[PDB]
A paper describes a structure:
Here, we identify a novel transcription factor, CapW, that is associated with hundreds of distinct CBASS systems. Two structures of CapW from different bacteria reveal a dimeric assembly that likely binds a small-molecule ligand to control DNA binding and transcriptional repression.
We next crystallized and determined the structure of Sm CapW to 1.89 Å resolution. The CapW homodimer adopts a distinctive domain-swapped overall architecture with the N-terminal wHTH domains adjacent to one another, followed by extended linkers reaching across the dimer such that each protomer's WYL domain interacts primarily with the wHTH domain of the opposite protomer. The two WCX domains define a groove across the top of the CapW dimer that extends between the putative ligand-binding sites of each WYL domain (see next section). In DNA-free structures of both CapW and BrxR, the wHTH domains of the two protomers are positioned adjacent to one another, with their DNA-binding surfaces aligned on one face of the dimer. We modelled a DNA-bound structure of CapW based on a structure of Acinetobacter BrxR bound to its cognate palindromic DNA sequence, revealing that the two wHTH domains in the CapW dimer are perfectly aligned to bind a palindromic DNA sequence ∼20 base pairs in length, close to the length of palindromic sequences we identified as CapW binding sites. In Sm CapW, both CapWR32A and CapWSQS-AAA eliminated detectable binding of the protein to its binding site in the CBASS promoter. In CapW, the tryptophan residue is highly conserved, while the typical tyrosine residue in WYL domains is replaced by a highly conserved histidine (His171 in Sm CapW). This histidine residue is solvent-exposed on the top face of the CapW dimer, and is surrounded by a cluster of highly-conserved hydrophobic and polar residues including Tyr145, Ser147, Trp156, Arg169, Arg183, Phe185 and Arg189 (Sm CapW residue numbering).
Residue numbers in the entry:
A (entry chain A), B (entry chain A): 8 to 292
The structure:
Amino acid sequence: KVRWGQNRRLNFIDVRLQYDGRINRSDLMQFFDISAPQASADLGLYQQLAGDNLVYDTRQRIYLATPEFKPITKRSEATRYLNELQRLARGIVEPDESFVGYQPSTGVVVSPSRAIEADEVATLLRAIRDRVALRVRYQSMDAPEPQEWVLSPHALGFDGLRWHARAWCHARQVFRDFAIGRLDVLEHVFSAKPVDPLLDEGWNNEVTVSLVPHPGLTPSQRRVVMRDYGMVDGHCELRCRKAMLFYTLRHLNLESLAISDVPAQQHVVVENAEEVKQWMREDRD
Amino acid sequence: KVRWGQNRRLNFIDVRLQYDGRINRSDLMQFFDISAPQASADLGLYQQLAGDNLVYDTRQRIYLATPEFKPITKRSEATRYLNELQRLARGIVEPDESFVGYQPSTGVVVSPSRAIEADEVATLLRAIRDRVALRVRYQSMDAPEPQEWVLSPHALGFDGLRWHARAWCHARQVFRDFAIGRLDVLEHVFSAKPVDPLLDEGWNNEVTVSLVPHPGLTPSQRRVVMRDYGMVDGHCELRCRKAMLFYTLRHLNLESLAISDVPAQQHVVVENAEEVKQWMREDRD
């Protein structure tokens, strides 16, 4: 059997062949800090497992991907690789943490936010896991003077820009959202009443947002929008938690539910506008 | 010296102690498919390198993080770990590809898009690296009937939802953007004129968007906004390529430059509105 480390080196060969179209022994030696004989043995094992993927060129002393290349691992897929380029450009990871070979010039939009402390995220995650209540300070636009609350968190949500904790608010007796960047966790409240998170109907009930191309588009433009949004059969059925519906519409700029008279500024419309309106009124209550 | 594999296992111990607050030998054995003696040796090496971070509890047979814990690697930082939770929830990676231990219930907004083929991304990346021209089919809202162009790509951009190639358009004689999900790459055009990407002024000129809290906010609300946006000293200086300015403003909902009379719907305003307007007119030209 192939051990975990060597398998990661086979993944590295596979992804370099897929995107760079070539790999040298020295690329393996430098990334993984292995010897020339081990790196040659890794390339030999890749040749044994998937010989049609690559040829060795003795003039250039390099392995070249063939036109027949097929990745041996799903970890070489395009969504993952584009996500890696985003993480490198945003500085989330360093080049020595990534299998990416050629790094193109990249421009990625910036999401300005408060850097969160690991210790606070950790306290929240463990409180979720252990179903325990936390005394916190929280400040908001409607209540900017920091105020203390007792919260029992049970989930995390990401709205496209920032994270929030989904939690029972013991004072207001509701499940609701708390931006993690606005929370100061102070101590545990072990005497608080246990909360059943299965009672958070907004979090646990999934709903469907049915999206279609704006009906004022020509058939040719419709096909463009369909391809842009990965629509199968002329619509896109987006599934989300009811308590994530508002965030989802904001993330996709779908908050204006009416079908406008301007197709060019509204490529996609929500088919089930009345369901969506109703679901948001229920959840904000 | 510690080898690459064992160092990844030390990283795994560090991140489990930071967020789960505990780790068992069997967690290492199962994730990395190693023997009990090797996993014990990894935990012993972690104890040697950072003994104040953890204690072994013989009653529970588990290693517990201490209140004094300090991560031995920056790879345990919170931005990375929250990014991992996002990638797991979006299905970008599988649990066996991630060091995340406890996985909370998560809700993440959905970005509907066309799944891109690795082979097309690969052809584009290599064309960027080798500075070669490509014959492509492209369809857009303004020109929906697929049309062929000769493009020399030199960079990639991400607008918050989708990727584009930055490229010289040989027919229209301009540098401009092409959504990768709308591109069909057909063949290389080796007889085309070479293009100097240093002549793409929009791509290479960085500009500053100066952001401040809306001036109608009370001082207490201002402090909330400042914390939300990670503002140092009452403003945020966002740096981006001129050719990414429009995408940046759209991603942050800053396209309406005027200072509105409604602080609650416009938490942040652009200080240098006239510079930004001018820079966008230059770039769309």
